[PDB]
mmCIF file of C-alpha atoms and ligand atoms in Angstrom:
data_model
loop_
_atom_site.group_PDB
_atom_site.id
_atom_site.type_symbol
_atom_site.label_atom_id
_atom_site.label_comp_id
_atom_site.label_asym_id
_atom_site.label_seq_id
_atom_site.Cartn_x
_atom_site.Cartn_y
_atom_site.Cartn_z
ATOM 1 C CA UNK D 8 0.000 0.000 0.000
ATOM 2 C CA UNK D 9 1.365 3.376 1.110
ATOM 3 C CA UNK D 10 4.964 3.089 2.342
ATOM 4 C CA UNK D 11 7.215 4.681 5.019
ATOM 5 C CA UNK D 12 9.682 7.145 3.428
ATOM 6 C CA UNK D 13 12.934 8.352 5.045
ATOM 7 C CA UNK D 14 14.437 11.485 3.417
ATOM 8 C CA UNK D 15 18.074 12.649 3.960
ATOM 9 C CA UNK D 16 19.227 16.256 3.682
ATOM 10 C CA UNK D 17 22.054 18.529 5.001
ATOM 11 C CA UNK D 18 21.223 22.234 5.032
ATOM 12 C CA UNK D 19 24.826 22.989 4.101
ATOM 13 C CA UNK D 20 24.845 20.930 0.850
ATOM 14 C CA UNK D 21 23.794 23.960 -1.271
ATOM 15 C CA UNK D 22 26.802 26.012 -0.131
ATOM 16 C CA UNK D 23 29.455 23.809 -1.890
ATOM 17 C CA UNK D 24 30.679 25.637 -5.030
ATOM 18 C CA UNK D 25 32.368 23.614 -7.826
ATOM 19 C CA UNK D 26 33.780 26.752 -9.494
ATOM 20 C CA UNK D 27 32.740 29.508 -11.933
ATOM 21 C CA UNK D 28 30.827 28.055 -14.872
ATOM 22 C CA UNK D 29 30.974 24.425 -13.722
ATOM 23 C CA UNK D 30 27.617 22.699 -14.464
ATOM 24 C CA UNK D 31 27.471 20.794 -11.142
ATOM 25 C CA UNK D 32 25.439 23.040 -8.814
ATOM 26 C CA UNK D 33 24.760 21.651 -5.299
ATOM 27 C CA UNK D 34 22.300 24.575 -4.863
ATOM 28 C CA UNK D 35 19.815 22.370 -6.890
ATOM 29 C CA UNK D 36 19.414 20.082 -3.792
ATOM 30 C CA UNK D 37 18.486 23.100 -1.593
ATOM 31 C CA UNK D 38 15.993 24.243 -4.306
ATOM 32 C CA UNK D 39 14.509 20.680 -4.313
ATOM 33 C CA UNK D 40 14.212 20.606 -0.480
ATOM 34 C CA UNK D 41 12.672 24.051 -0.370
ATOM 35 C CA UNK D 42 10.122 23.118 -3.001
ATOM 36 C CA UNK D 43 9.022 19.815 -1.429
ATOM 37 C CA UNK D 44 8.918 21.520 2.029
ATOM 38 C CA UNK D 45 6.716 24.314 0.579
ATOM 39 C CA UNK D 46 4.295 21.720 -0.859
ATOM 40 C CA UNK D 47 3.914 20.232 2.716
ATOM 41 C CA UNK D 48 5.723 16.896 2.095
ATOM 42 C CA UNK D 49 7.603 17.155 5.436
ATOM 43 C CA UNK D 50 4.347 16.137 7.209
ATOM 44 C CA UNK D 51 4.360 12.735 5.450
ATOM 45 C CA UNK D 52 8.011 11.640 5.758
ATOM 46 C CA UNK D 53 10.905 11.423 8.212
ATOM 47 C CA UNK D 54 13.616 13.956 7.589
ATOM 48 C CA UNK D 55 17.125 13.068 8.753
ATOM 49 C CA UNK D 56 20.441 14.841 8.505
ATOM 50 C CA UNK D 57 23.108 12.480 7.224
ATOM 51 C CA UNK D 58 26.341 11.945 9.123
ATOM 52 C CA UNK D 59 29.702 12.761 7.517
ATOM 53 C CA UNK D 60 30.898 9.334 6.206
ATOM 54 C CA UNK D 61 34.353 8.388 7.455
ATOM 55 C CA UNK D 62 37.427 7.353 5.421
ATOM 56 C CA UNK D 63 36.786 3.843 6.890
ATOM 57 C CA UNK D 64 33.309 3.819 5.280
ATOM 58 C CA UNK D 65 34.622 5.143 1.968
ATOM 59 C CA UNK D 66 37.442 2.570 1.842
ATOM 60 C CA UNK D 67 35.017 -0.374 1.788
ATOM 61 C CA UNK D 68 35.261 0.174 -2.057
ATOM 62 C CA UNK D 69 37.804 2.984 -2.623
ATOM 63 C CA UNK D 70 41.567 2.638 -2.180
ATOM 64 C CA UNK D 71 43.259 4.230 0.821
ATOM 65 C CA UNK D 72 45.562 6.272 -1.458
ATOM 66 C CA UNK D 73 42.668 7.833 -3.332
ATOM 67 C CA UNK D 74 40.690 8.610 -0.113
ATOM 68 C CA UNK D 75 43.807 10.101 1.648
ATOM 69 C CA UNK D 76 44.389 12.313 -1.436
ATOM 70 C CA UNK D 77 40.737 13.431 -1.387
ATOM 71 C CA UNK D 78 40.856 14.184 2.347
ATOM 72 C CA UNK D 79 44.049 16.323 2.080
ATOM 73 C CA UNK D 80 43.805 18.185 -1.283
ATOM 74 C CA UNK D 81 42.803 21.911 -1.124
ATOM 75 C CA UNK D 82 42.941 24.992 -3.449
ATOM 76 C CA UNK D 83 45.897 26.297 -1.405
ATOM 77 C CA UNK D 84 48.096 23.127 -1.459
ATOM 78 C CA UNK D 85 47.107 22.294 -5.094
ATOM 79 C CA UNK D 86 50.575 22.986 -6.661
ATOM 80 C CA UNK D 87 52.174 20.439 -4.300
ATOM 81 C CA UNK D 88 49.975 17.541 -5.473
ATOM 82 C CA UNK D 89 50.412 18.030 -9.311
ATOM 83 C CA UNK D 90 51.281 14.293 -9.892
ATOM 84 C CA UNK D 91 48.573 12.920 -7.547
ATOM 85 C CA UNK D 92 45.932 15.142 -9.247
ATOM 86 C CA UNK D 93 46.730 13.610 -12.657
ATOM 87 C CA UNK D 94 46.765 10.038 -11.209
ATOM 88 C CA UNK D 95 43.276 10.446 -9.628
ATOM 89 C CA UNK D 96 41.717 12.517 -12.507
ATOM 90 C CA UNK D 97 41.213 15.636 -10.400
ATOM 91 C CA UNK D 98 41.382 18.738 -12.559
ATOM 92 C CA UNK D 99 38.995 20.354 -15.020
ATOM 93 C CA UNK D 100 35.938 18.027 -14.846
ATOM 94 C CA UNK D 101 36.339 17.160 -11.137
ATOM 95 C CA UNK D 102 37.909 20.349 -9.738
ATOM 96 C CA UNK D 103 39.597 20.979 -6.393
ATOM 97 C CA UNK D 104 37.200 23.206 -4.445
ATOM 98 C CA UNK D 105 36.660 24.486 -0.893
ATOM 99 C CA UNK D 106 35.120 21.719 1.270
ATOM 100 C CA UNK D 107 35.376 19.011 -1.449
ATOM 101 C CA UNK D 108 35.902 16.204 1.074
ATOM 102 C CA UNK D 109 33.020 17.386 3.296
ATOM 103 C CA UNK D 110 30.645 17.408 0.254
ATOM 104 C CA UNK D 111 31.605 13.778 -0.456
ATOM 105 C CA UNK D 112 30.997 12.852 3.223
ATOM 106 C CA UNK D 113 27.464 14.343 3.149
ATOM 107 C CA UNK D 114 26.567 12.878 -0.227
ATOM 108 C CA UNK D 115 27.844 9.434 0.863
ATOM 109 C CA UNK D 116 26.484 9.674 4.400
ATOM 110 C CA UNK D 117 22.895 9.806 3.233
ATOM 111 C CA UNK D 118 23.220 6.853 0.855
ATOM 112 C CA UNK D 119 24.826 4.570 3.449
ATOM 113 C CA UNK D 120 22.362 5.767 6.161
ATOM 114 C CA UNK D 121 19.459 4.945 3.853
ATOM 115 C CA UNK D 122 20.897 1.490 3.140
ATOM 116 C CA UNK D 123 21.340 0.852 6.905
ATOM 117 C CA UNK D 124 17.792 2.155 7.582
ATOM 118 C CA UNK D 125 16.422 -0.182 4.866
ATOM 119 C CA UNK D 126 18.578 -3.130 6.102
ATOM 120 C CA UNK D 127 17.124 -2.844 9.614
ATOM 121 C CA UNK D 128 13.588 -2.916 8.085
ATOM 122 C CA UNK D 129 12.873 0.502 9.642
ATOM 123 C CA UNK D 130 11.670 1.977 6.276
ATOM 124 C CA UNK D 131 10.338 0.839 2.889
ATOM 125 C CA UNK D 132 12.021 3.688 0.934
ATOM 126 C CA UNK D 133 15.067 5.812 1.587
ATOM 127 C CA UNK D 134 15.733 9.012 -0.438
ATOM 128 C CA UNK D 135 19.061 10.834 -0.811
ATOM 129 C CA UNK D 136 18.986 13.426 -3.608
ATOM 130 C CA UNK D 137 22.596 14.528 -2.885
ATOM 131 C CA UNK D 138 23.732 10.945 -3.805
ATOM 132 C CA UNK D 139 23.660 9.006 -7.052
ATOM 133 C CA UNK D 140 27.187 10.026 -8.154
ATOM 134 C CA UNK D 141 27.543 6.922 -10.469
ATOM 135 C CA UNK D 142 30.826 7.761 -12.342
ATOM 136 C CA UNK D 143 33.334 7.665 -9.475
ATOM 137 C CA UNK D 144 35.859 4.824 -9.791
ATOM 138 C CA UNK D 145 37.870 2.877 -7.145
ATOM 139 C CA UNK D 146 40.991 5.103 -7.423
ATOM 140 C CA UNK D 147 39.761 7.848 -9.725
ATOM 141 C CA UNK D 148 37.265 10.705 -9.796
ATOM 142 C CA UNK D 149 35.182 11.014 -12.987
ATOM 143 C CA UNK D 150 32.413 13.211 -14.483
ATOM 144 C CA UNK D 151 31.924 15.581 -11.497
ATOM 145 C CA UNK D 152 31.846 12.592 -9.027
ATOM 146 C CA UNK D 153 34.567 11.769 -6.480
ATOM 147 C CA UNK D 154 33.130 9.148 -4.130
ATOM 148 C CA UNK D 155 30.778 6.439 -5.416
ATOM 149 C CA UNK D 156 28.116 6.551 -2.711
ATOM 150 C CA UNK D 157 25.982 4.111 -4.736
ATOM 151 C CA UNK D 158 28.593 1.355 -4.656
ATOM 152 C CA UNK D 159 29.109 1.901 -0.924
ATOM 153 C CA UNK D 160 25.343 1.797 -0.303
ATOM 154 C CA UNK D 161 25.072 -1.413 -2.389
ATOM 155 C CA UNK D 162 27.933 -2.961 -0.352
ATOM 156 C CA UNK D 163 25.890 -2.056 2.762
ATOM 157 C CA UNK D 164 22.752 -3.718 1.381
ATOM 158 C CA UNK D 165 24.743 -6.855 0.397
ATOM 159 C CA UNK D 166 25.163 -7.508 4.173
ATOM 160 C CA UNK D 167 21.476 -8.511 4.544
ATOM 161 C CA UNK D 168 20.543 -9.085 0.829
ATOM 162 C CA UNK D 169 21.839 -11.912 -1.421
ATOM 163 C CA UNK D 170 20.727 -10.137 -4.704
ATOM 164 C CA UNK D 171 20.485 -6.290 -5.171
ATOM 165 C CA UNK D 172 19.088 -4.601 -8.366
ATOM 166 C CA UNK D 173 20.563 -1.297 -9.506
ATOM 167 C CA UNK D 174 18.559 0.773 -12.088
ATOM 168 C CA UNK D 175 20.032 3.936 -13.643
ATOM 169 C CA UNK D 176 17.807 6.407 -15.490
ATOM 170 C CA UNK D 177 20.462 9.234 -15.759
ATOM 171 C CA UNK D 178 21.210 10.280 -19.387
ATOM 172 C CA UNK D 179 24.793 8.974 -18.972
ATOM 173 C CA UNK D 180 25.874 5.335 -18.529
ATOM 174 C CA UNK D 181 26.479 4.348 -14.860
ATOM 175 C CA UNK D 182 29.998 3.156 -15.539
ATOM 176 C CA UNK D 183 31.305 3.312 -11.974
ATOM 177 C CA UNK D 184 28.518 1.160 -10.567
ATOM 178 C CA UNK D 185 28.683 -1.333 -13.473
ATOM 179 C CA UNK D 186 32.527 -1.653 -13.160
ATOM 180 C CA UNK D 187 32.399 -2.156 -9.395
ATOM 181 C CA UNK D 188 30.077 -5.220 -9.686
ATOM 182 C CA UNK D 189 30.938 -6.337 -13.257
ATOM 183 C CA UNK D 190 32.115 -9.778 -12.188
ATOM 184 C CA UNK D 191 29.419 -10.786 -9.705
ATOM 185 C CA UNK D 192 25.869 -12.113 -9.908
ATOM 186 C CA UNK D 193 25.087 -10.582 -6.426
ATOM 187 C CA UNK D 194 24.348 -7.203 -8.045
ATOM 188 C CA UNK D 195 22.565 -6.710 -11.379
ATOM 189 C CA UNK D 196 23.188 -3.274 -12.921
ATOM 190 C CA UNK D 197 20.575 -2.176 -15.471
ATOM 191 C CA UNK D 198 21.323 1.149 -17.208
ATOM 192 C CA UNK D 199 19.306 3.162 -19.816
ATOM 193 C CA UNK D 200 21.407 5.931 -21.316
ATOM 194 C CA UNK D 201 22.336 7.874 -24.477
ATOM 195 C CA UNK D 202 25.148 6.196 -26.420
ATOM 196 C CA UNK D 203 27.491 6.821 -29.322
ATOM 197 C CA UNK D 204 29.804 9.268 -31.102
ATOM 198 C CA UNK D 205 32.071 10.308 -28.219
ATOM 199 C CA UNK D 206 29.226 10.813 -25.703
ATOM 200 C CA UNK D 207 30.374 10.691 -22.075
ATOM 201 C CA UNK D 208 31.503 8.355 -20.614
ATOM 202 C CA UNK D 209 32.005 6.317 -23.826
ATOM 203 C CA UNK D 210 30.844 3.012 -22.305
ATOM 204 C CA UNK D 211 27.431 1.291 -22.080
ATOM 205 C CA UNK D 212 27.309 -0.818 -25.245
ATOM 206 C CA UNK D 213 24.462 -3.342 -25.549
ATOM 207 C CA UNK D 214 27.140 -6.085 -25.973
ATOM 208 C CA UNK D 215 28.580 -5.217 -22.484
ATOM 209 C CA UNK D 216 26.839 -7.950 -20.406
ATOM 210 C CA UNK D 217 29.248 -8.666 -17.525
ATOM 211 C CA UNK D 218 32.216 -10.985 -17.019
ATOM 212 C CA UNK D 219 32.989 -14.238 -15.135
ATOM 213 C CA UNK D 220 30.322 -15.031 -12.506
ATOM 214 C CA UNK D 221 28.670 -11.705 -13.482
ATOM 215 C CA UNK D 222 28.090 -12.645 -17.131
ATOM 216 C CA UNK D 223 24.480 -11.691 -17.990
ATOM 217 C CA UNK D 224 24.286 -9.474 -14.808
ATOM 218 C CA UNK D 225 25.088 -6.145 -16.582
ATOM 219 C CA UNK D 226 22.264 -4.771 -18.788
ATOM 220 C CA UNK D 227 22.664 -1.733 -21.054
ATOM 221 C CA UNK D 228 20.032 0.015 -23.188
ATOM 222 C CA UNK D 229 21.820 2.389 -25.570
ATOM 223 C CA UNK D 230 19.538 5.164 -26.876
ATOM 224 C CA UNK D 231 19.963 8.068 -29.410
ATOM 225 C CA UNK D 232 19.037 11.827 -29.004
ATOM 226 C CA UNK D 233 15.402 12.943 -28.497
ATOM 227 C CA UNK D 234 13.823 9.997 -26.650
ATOM 228 C CA UNK D 235 10.264 10.976 -25.523
ATOM 229 C CA UNK D 236 7.946 9.812 -22.625
ATOM 230 C CA UNK D 237 6.050 7.415 -24.994
ATOM 231 C CA UNK D 238 9.241 5.691 -26.361
ATOM 232 C CA UNK D 239 10.898 5.386 -22.903
ATOM 233 C CA UNK D 240 7.608 4.201 -21.349
ATOM 234 C CA UNK D 241 7.219 1.281 -23.758
ATOM 235 C CA UNK D 242 10.661 -0.141 -22.848
ATOM 236 C CA UNK D 243 11.071 0.530 -19.134
ATOM 237 C CA UNK D 244 8.191 -1.555 -17.665
ATOM 238 C CA UNK D 245 8.800 -4.658 -19.903
ATOM 239 C CA UNK D 246 12.601 -4.690 -19.208
ATOM 240 C CA UNK D 247 12.213 -4.076 -15.452
ATOM 241 C CA UNK D 248 9.378 -6.683 -15.206
ATOM 242 C CA UNK D 249 11.590 -9.359 -16.888
ATOM 243 C CA UNK D 250 14.598 -8.414 -14.765
ATOM 244 C CA UNK D 251 12.356 -8.882 -11.652
ATOM 245 C CA UNK D 252 11.087 -12.276 -12.879
ATOM 246 C CA UNK D 253 14.538 -13.668 -13.793
ATOM 247 C CA UNK D 254 16.726 -11.964 -11.214
ATOM 248 C CA UNK D 255 14.291 -12.053 -8.248
ATOM 249 C CA UNK D 256 16.034 -9.331 -6.091
ATOM 250 C CA UNK D 257 15.273 -8.493 -2.437
ATOM 251 C CA UNK D 258 16.418 -4.809 -2.540
ATOM 252 C CA UNK D 259 16.501 -2.158 -5.227
ATOM 253 C CA UNK D 260 18.646 1.002 -5.718
ATOM 254 C CA UNK D 261 17.255 3.465 -8.283
ATOM 255 C CA UNK D 262 19.541 6.358 -9.410
ATOM 256 C CA UNK D 263 17.160 9.128 -10.699
ATOM 257 C CA UNK D 264 19.506 11.388 -12.711
ATOM 258 C CA UNK D 265 17.483 14.340 -14.061
ATOM 259 C CA UNK D 266 19.926 15.114 -16.931
ATOM 260 C CA UNK D 267 17.619 12.824 -19.082
ATOM 261 C CA UNK D 268 14.832 15.537 -18.955
ATOM 262 C CA UNK D 269 13.735 17.784 -21.855
ATOM 263 C CA UNK D 270 15.782 20.966 -22.063
ATOM 264 C CA UNK D 271 18.666 19.808 -19.803
ATOM 265 C CA UNK D 272 21.767 21.911 -20.615
ATOM 266 C CA UNK D 273 23.972 18.765 -20.686
ATOM 267 C CA UNK D 274 21.437 16.219 -22.022
ATOM 268 C CA UNK D 275 19.758 15.591 -25.367
ATOM 269 C CA UNK D 276 16.723 13.538 -24.190
ATOM 270 C CA UNK D 277 13.095 14.772 -24.270
ATOM 271 C CA UNK D 278 11.355 13.227 -21.235
ATOM 272 C CA UNK D 279 8.976 15.329 -19.140
ATOM 273 C CA UNK D 280 8.770 15.047 -15.272
ATOM 274 C CA UNK D 281 5.684 12.749 -15.612
ATOM 275 C CA UNK D 282 7.654 10.497 -18.014
ATOM 276 C CA UNK D 283 10.727 10.440 -15.784
ATOM 277 C CA UNK D 284 8.606 9.801 -12.604
ATOM 278 C CA UNK D 285 6.826 6.905 -14.382
ATOM 279 C CA UNK D 286 10.062 4.884 -13.738
ATOM 280 C CA UNK D 287 9.789 5.440 -9.957
ATOM 281 C CA UNK D 288 6.104 4.276 -10.062
ATOM 282 C CA UNK D 289 7.089 1.179 -12.070
ATOM 283 C CA UNK D 290 9.834 0.181 -9.643
ATOM 284 C CA UNK D 291 7.558 0.943 -6.659
ATOM 285 C CA UNK D 292 4.883 -1.642 -7.737
ATOM 286 C CA UNK D 293 7.269 -4.554 -6.902
ATOM 287 C CA UNK D 294 7.075 -3.546 -3.173
ATOM 288 C CA UNK D 295 10.765 -4.252 -2.511
ATOM 289 C CA UNK D 296 13.053 -2.223 -0.109
ATOM 290 C CA UNK D 297 14.004 0.776 -2.258
ATOM 291 C CA UNK D 298 16.870 3.311 -2.080
ATOM 292 C CA UNK D 299 16.238 6.384 -4.326
ATOM 293 C CA UNK D 300 19.239 8.521 -5.311
ATOM 294 C CA UNK D 301 19.902 11.733 -7.298
ATOM 295 C CA UNK D 302 22.450 12.196 -10.089
ATOM 296 C CA UNK D 303 22.793 14.435 -13.135
ATOM 297 C CA UNK D 304 20.937 17.680 -13.913
ATOM 298 C CA UNK D 305 22.152 21.187 -15.102
ATOM 299 C CA UNK D 306 18.728 22.931 -15.684
ATOM 300 C CA UNK D 307 18.296 23.274 -11.854
ATOM 301 C CA UNK D 308 14.658 24.456 -12.099
ATOM 302 C CA UNK D 309 13.779 21.145 -13.830
ATOM 303 C CA UNK D 310 15.904 19.147 -11.371
ATOM 304 C CA UNK D 311 13.979 20.682 -8.417
ATOM 305 C CA UNK D 312 10.620 19.967 -10.114
ATOM 306 C CA UNK D 313 11.554 16.347 -11.005
ATOM 307 C CA UNK D 314 12.832 15.298 -7.576
ATOM 308 C CA UNK D 315 9.958 17.108 -5.773
ATOM 309 C CA UNK D 316 7.478 15.111 -7.884
ATOM 310 C CA UNK D 317 9.398 11.824 -7.493
ATOM 311 C CA UNK D 318 9.392 12.320 -3.681
ATOM 312 C CA UNK D 319 5.558 12.878 -3.968
ATOM 313 C CA UNK D 320 5.250 9.680 -6.088
ATOM 314 C CA UNK D 321 7.218 7.743 -3.467
ATOM 315 C CA UNK D 322 4.760 9.071 -0.838
ATOM 316 C CA UNK D 323 1.670 8.317 -3.043
ATOM 317 C CA UNK D 324 0.882 12.039 -2.520
ATOM 318 C CA UNK D 325 -0.990 14.036 -5.133
ATOM 319 C CA UNK D 326 0.421 17.572 -5.415
ATOM 320 C CA UNK D 327 -0.952 20.492 -7.485
ATOM 321 C CA UNK D 328 0.697 21.520 -10.775
ATOM 322 C CA UNK D 329 0.444 25.132 -9.490
ATOM 323 C CA UNK D 330 3.739 25.709 -7.637
ATOM 324 C CA UNK D 331 3.566 26.927 -4.036
ATOM 325 C CA UNK D 332 5.484 30.086 -3.097
ATOM 326 C CA UNK D 333 9.096 29.264 -2.190
ATOM 327 C CA UNK D 334 12.574 30.762 -1.677
ATOM 328 C CA UNK D 335 13.371 30.270 -5.407
ATOM 329 C CA UNK D 336 9.952 31.073 -6.968
ATOM 330 C CA UNK D 337 11.594 33.270 -9.669
ATOM 331 C CA UNK D 338 13.649 30.265 -11.021
ATOM 332 C CA UNK D 339 10.380 28.558 -12.187
ATOM 333 C CA UNK D 340 9.184 31.349 -14.432
ATOM 334 C CA UNK D 341 7.399 32.179 -16.659
ATOM 335 C CA UNK D 342 4.834 29.401 -15.954
ATOM 336 C CA UNK D 343 5.364 28.741 -12.184
ATOM 337 C CA UNK D 344 4.020 25.188 -12.857
ATOM 338 C CA UNK D 345 5.488 21.871 -11.594
ATOM 339 C CA UNK D 346 5.170 19.937 -14.871
ATOM 340 C CA UNK D 347 7.223 20.545 -17.988
ATOM 341 C CA UNK D 348 6.426 20.292 -21.719
ATOM 342 C CA UNK D 349 8.497 18.296 -24.198
ATOM 343 C CA UNK D 350 10.379 20.079 -26.996
ATOM 344 C CA UNK D 351 9.841 19.731 -30.814
ATOM 345 C CA UNK D 352 13.138 17.797 -31.176
ATOM 346 C CA UNK D 353 13.337 14.768 -33.389
ATOM 347 C CA UNK D 354 13.209 11.423 -31.616
ATOM 348 C CA UNK D 355 16.122 9.506 -33.299
ATOM 349 C CA UNK D 356 14.884 6.352 -31.554
ATOM 350 C CA UNK D 357 12.444 4.813 -34.044
ATOM 351 C CA UNK D 358 9.871 2.469 -32.391
ATOM 352 C CA UNK D 359 11.478 -0.407 -34.330
ATOM 353 C CA UNK D 360 14.884 0.426 -32.799
ATOM 354 C CA UNK D 361 13.297 0.404 -29.294
ATOM 355 C CA UNK D 362 11.729 -3.013 -29.926
ATOM 356 C CA UNK D 363 14.925 -4.451 -31.467
ATOM 357 C CA UNK D 364 17.176 -3.462 -28.520
ATOM 358 C CA UNK D 365 14.494 -4.704 -26.059
ATOM 359 C CA UNK D 366 14.308 -8.043 -27.959
ATOM 360 C CA UNK D 367 18.128 -8.531 -27.784
ATOM 361 C CA UNK D 368 18.033 -7.681 -24.051
ATOM 362 C CA UNK D 369 15.362 -10.331 -23.346
ATOM 363 C CA UNK D 370 17.624 -12.907 -25.180
ATOM 364 C CA UNK D 371 20.391 -12.186 -22.624
ATOM 365 C CA UNK D 372 17.825 -12.373 -19.758
ATOM 366 C CA UNK D 373 16.910 -15.950 -20.831
ATOM 367 C CA UNK D 374 20.504 -16.939 -19.776
ATOM 368 C CA UNK D 375 19.853 -16.434 -16.053
ATOM 369 C CA UNK D 376 19.155 -19.632 -14.063
HETATM 370 C C1 LIG I 1 24.995 16.540 -15.024
HETATM 371 S S1 LIG I 1 25.930 16.899 -13.546
HETATM 372 C C2 LIG I 1 26.094 15.340 -12.716
HETATM 373 C C3 LIG I 1 25.760 15.324 -11.358
HETATM 374 C C4 LIG I 1 25.896 14.164 -10.614
HETATM 375 C C5 LIG I 1 26.354 13.007 -11.208
HETATM 376 C C6 LIG I 1 26.688 12.999 -12.547
HETATM 377 C C7 LIG I 1 26.576 14.159 -13.320
HETATM 378 C C8 LIG I 1 27.049 13.957 -14.727
HETATM 379 O O1 LIG I 1 26.269 13.579 -15.597
HETATM 380 N N1 LIG I 1 28.351 14.141 -14.963
HETATM 381 C C9 LIG I 1 28.986 13.880 -16.248
HETATM 382 C C10 LIG I 1 28.782 15.008 -17.222
HETATM 383 C C11 LIG I 1 29.634 14.937 -18.474
HETATM 384 C C12 LIG I 1 31.090 15.336 -18.286
HETATM 385 C C13 LIG I 1 31.627 16.037 -19.543
HETATM 386 N N2 LIG I 1 33.059 15.848 -19.672
HETATM 387 C C14 LIG I 1 33.610 15.101 -20.639
HETATM 388 O O2 LIG I 1 32.984 14.636 -21.597
HETATM 389 C C15 LIG I 1 35.062 14.881 -20.494
HETATM 390 C C16 LIG I 1 35.912 15.360 -19.532
HETATM 391 N N3 LIG I 1 37.241 15.012 -19.653
HETATM 392 C C17 LIG I 1 37.388 14.272 -20.705
HETATM 393 S S2 LIG I 1 35.964 13.941 -21.617
HETATM 394 C C18 LIG I 1 31.359 17.515 -19.536
HETATM 395 N N4 LIG I 1 30.255 18.027 -20.043
HETATM 396 C C19 LIG I 1 30.366 19.380 -19.829
HETATM 397 C C20 LIG I 1 31.548 19.691 -19.191
HETATM 398 C C21 LIG I 1 31.992 20.954 -18.571
HETATM 399 C C22 LIG I 1 31.447 22.168 -18.988
HETATM 400 C C23 LIG I 1 31.821 23.341 -18.404
HETATM 401 C C24 LIG I 1 32.771 23.365 -17.358
HETATM 402 C C25 LIG I 1 33.201 24.564 -16.740
HETATM 403 C C26 LIG I 1 34.158 24.544 -15.764
HETATM 404 C C27 LIG I 1 34.720 23.347 -15.354
HETATM 405 C C28 LIG I 1 34.320 22.164 -15.915
HETATM 406 C C29 LIG I 1 33.337 22.139 -16.933
HETATM 407 C C30 LIG I 1 32.925 20.943 -17.562
HETATM 408 N N5 LIG I 1 32.168 18.474 -19.012
HETATM 409 CA CA1 LIG I 2 21.927 5.673 -17.064
HETATM 410 CA CA1 LIG I 3 26.937 -7.356 -12.110
HETATM 411 ZN ZN1 LIG I 4 24.609 12.168 -16.038
#
């Protein structure tokens, strides 16, 4: 029926600045919080402030060398660590900024706290919008991510769950999560993303299905520019339903990257908030312990709308399209509405392409015991 939702948020998260012109804007999490608070969602869920994850917690997946570098690097001592910066991919994409390590601790802290809270059966859904940083590697930062909170949270769930299902609806391929569990059947990583012609991160081919004991436990749905609600909607439920039937998981982690929305400054997809939220509703019908994370998103007004609505969906709460007054009301102009309209962009994904990729995916799903 209606489930218990635990929400994680640190009031300071919005103060971390990546640098002038960088598209990663932590302020989008404070806009999200302010919007869902202003709609009255605080009355229906538990709000918790996440702890600052320790180097011990982070090293359950990451190397000590990489975590020690992260916990010591600063804009002032930058010149000293020139070699280490290159080794760990800290530079233009993943800059060195004031409070970098603290930001990682808060982002991670909520994901691991949600996994613990779910493990103890104290909640049915845990939400951490500051998490979902799917590109971070064992000893390397990548695509604005430094610590892979998702991998750490999955490692936490694996303590009480034999099989965990990871679903990634960000526009980019969830490389870091896929790589972490590429050779195990204990975690199945299913990712829907845009693919081809030097599009970040370069990975996510349909033919990438896992290795060793993890062969057939890595699923990838490569899409082209312009995918709409209708096209995405016809593939998501059938793939997820088959993955549930064959894989039979006991816990689910769903990364909700909003960079797959219409008009995103870094994305080329054309989903609306109702189309994006349809994925949360689909996953929610299986009534399995669920951890909901954030991820991509540069058009911060659309990110705030999307995650406010997906929190409402998780609560089975109907909220009006008319936006309530809030601390960032001017960002949502000139409509001041919660829902967004799709653009006139061409959907390169022909329905036949969608059905062909889906067919090949189901072939691979037949290979599970
Ligand atoms: C959407 S924000 C997000 C939030 C949470 C989790 C994930 C994401 C995400 O999708 N991250 C990946 C985004 C793509 C990275 C992509 N980079 C590359 O392709 C390569 C880099 N090095 C070699 S190739 C990129 N797209 C735009 C820029 C960019 C633009 C302006 C900048 C101005 C200042 C400084 C840096 C900047 C980086 N970089
Ligand atoms: Ca994805
Ligand atoms: Ca796997
Ligand atoms: Zn992304």
